[PDB]
Design a protein around this ligand. Structure first.
Ligand code: PLP
Ligand code: PLP
Lengths: 389, 394
């Protein structure tokens, strides 16, 4: 029967096929340092050395994840707003597993839900939704010309969200646009959600890559304080640099202790029916780092150095661009926050840059500024200006 | 809206675990445990596993995203460990999964994709998780006789009669070895008959192989799977590294799809990768890397096999001791099946009423279906378990 299956990356091969020295791969989705490497964070390495020395068994652990991991992540994300008596926590297989589990959880509570996503959004969001058969709706977000947020459009579309519907919001560092909401915009969003009774699903995958650990969780913390029920899918892949360990977390904020129990039970059940227990290693690294003072101090230091480094890089790009353009048209570059940025260029311009200058971006013109370099910056700027973006 | 979320039932033994703990009796015994336990009541980390992690600590340079279907090294090593030299790489699709449970879930999603009208056949009895998952998916479930309550062995005639009803496209779930919870297993000749019935019906076999190496040996325990694999053109294999590598919490499993031709292998491999992506994206690296390190490193594989063997042999001597004790007390050989059962578990065949009678009078705990864990026994516990069994009229 397997022959009845339908035929369920290409750019990479195409990139590999390019013989031209000077190939620039800006389409990468992971952090990269000056020498094109994704290192293991000092604290993470120290945590693994410590773990190998203190673990005396690998027997089955907790179905919903370890309490130390659940608490540490709850505090990292919610800070002082962590109301554990009404918060259910589920350790998942990365942030993607968190989002998946979120969708299943919400669907169990509402077989008739629709999901609102930003235009554009992380493609893996929609593929999972389609695969689940969930109705997907979009809301305006990225303003093509100003390369910022189209907040008026966003307010217009979200206002139509119905009770029980879900609104997927990126907590910070919007993937792929790079354009983000301000605390004032976040507050207005909370008003809309409150009026509509739409459940918010916050995708927090880049806490620490925008303005700082605490600053990047501001919008999330605000939504959590205004709305009684909210779901938050967090990933430790990027900010802890443990992409392959598959460490993530799903948090369900409930109106009371009773609902918290329902949610927690259904969340654990969801894990049990999908793969039983969640992977221990990556989560153990995270809680060790977070609960050990000298380790957290160093993880913060390193993460801040990464963050500051990226800002420095995109400020140079903005400058280089401004000089060659004689205007601050590309100012948005230094204003965007995160690892990615959409240049707002057309598919035509994108391929023209690839074939003529050897710069590889994602079709929608998404570039990973971490993949840049002070030597690469001038070349990229020339390409943009020359191709007439 | 989270308020209209129906209550979800807790874990099966969870309650029994709490019941055991509350018991104030000095000398109570727990045989309901579902993991290996050594003489000292611990679940140690295998030597080769500890050594592999040490190697990884010194050699890994990055933690970037790796393979969506798992690492090639792991895929190859798992395929070879299970199918020996008969591994036709050209026609097998492989997928690293979150444990054996994840491989089972992925297999059911894969099969359901290829045939939306499939029914699954599970043994009577079988691992509870099997039914829970299928019930969660809304898959039709059929049963085939397996455990013979009177002889504690396999009711082969019943099994054959029930499986003969499987239609083309139906799925039959067989345990590769060490049947959990019964401990009763098929002989290679019985597997051969099973192969005939499956060829005849055109039903897809799904092999749940979680205890390779805990029965008669690493190669021996895979004979059944290999026979099926050689005679049936399309096979599904859900393997787990939890028990035989002792990495329960690292969540390391494997789903192998044997196909008739390369073209179909492509279709399956693509659908399998797609399944990982839509569930949790990339699979967990840690456990799979320990396993591939052990299997591909001469000294490690050697030490690992040596430790597994010591475990297997130890459990077997325990079975011998229990059976001997049972024989001396009963003045018969009714309990000879204990020395014949293979695996970590064994269904004694006691009724629920007898099981609770055993707990109340002798302070011995076991799963409500009379499933005991052989690894929980020892020189002191055996005599009491034997006397308990007999005193309750089992
Ligand atoms: C990285 C990322 C995730 C999750 O990644 P995982 O590898 O599954 O941790 C989810 N959403 C967005 C927008 C991301 O960028
Ligand atoms: C242990 C076991 C599994 C898989 O366990 P995982 O912890 O998910 O690796 C699958 N089937 C049976 C019969 C088992 O005993």
């Amino acid at each position: 029967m397997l022959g009845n299956l339908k035929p369920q990356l290409a750019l990479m091969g195409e990139f590999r096929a390019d013989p031209r020295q000077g190939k620039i791969d800006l389409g990468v989705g992971v952090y990269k340092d000056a020498t094109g490497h994704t290192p293991i964070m000092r604290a993470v390495h120290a945590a693994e050395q410590r773990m190998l020395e203190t673990e005396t068994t690998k027997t089955y652990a907790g179905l919903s994840g370890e309490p130390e991991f659940q608490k540490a992540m709850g505090e990292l994300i919610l800070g002082d707003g962590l109301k554990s008596e009404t918060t259910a926590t589920l350790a998942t297989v990365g942030g993607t597993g968190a989002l998946r589990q979120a969708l299943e959880l919400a669907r169990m509570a509402n077989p008739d839900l629709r999901v609102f996503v930003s235009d554009p959004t992380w493609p893996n969001h929609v593929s999972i939704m389609n695969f689940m058969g969930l109705p997907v709706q979009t809301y305006r977000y990225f303003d093509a010309e100003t390369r910022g947020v189209d907040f008026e459009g966003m307010k217009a579309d979200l206002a139509a969200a119905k009770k029980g519907d879900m609104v997927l919001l990126h907590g910070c560092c919007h993937n792929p646009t790079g354009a983000n909401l301000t605390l004032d915009q976040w507050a207005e969003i909370a008003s809309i959600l409150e009026k509509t009774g739409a459940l918010p699903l916050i995708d927090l995958a880049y806490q620490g890559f925008g303005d700082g650990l605490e600053e990047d969780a501001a919008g999330t913390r605000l939504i959590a304080s205004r709305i009684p029920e909210v779901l938050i899918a967090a990933s430790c892949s990027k900010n802890f640099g443990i992409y392959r360990e598959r460490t993530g977390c799903l948090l369900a904020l409930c109106a009371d202790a009773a609902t918290r129990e329902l949610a927690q039970g259904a969340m654990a059940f969801l894990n049990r029916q999908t793969y039983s227990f969640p992977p221990f290693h990556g989560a153990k690294i995270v809680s060790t780092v977070l609960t050990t003072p000298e380790l957290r101090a160093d993880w913060m230091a390193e993460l801040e150095a990464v963050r500051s480094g990226m800002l420095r890089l995109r400020e140079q790009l903005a400058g280089e661009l401004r000089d060659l353009s004689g205007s601050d048209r590309f100012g948005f570059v230094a204003e965007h926050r995160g690892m990615f940025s959409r240049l707002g260029a057309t598919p035509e311009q994108v391929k023209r840059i690839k074939e003529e200058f050897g710069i590889y971006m994602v079709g929608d013109s998404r570039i990973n500024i971490a993949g840049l370099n002070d030597n690469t910056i001038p070349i990229l700027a020339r390409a943009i200006i020359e191709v007439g973006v």
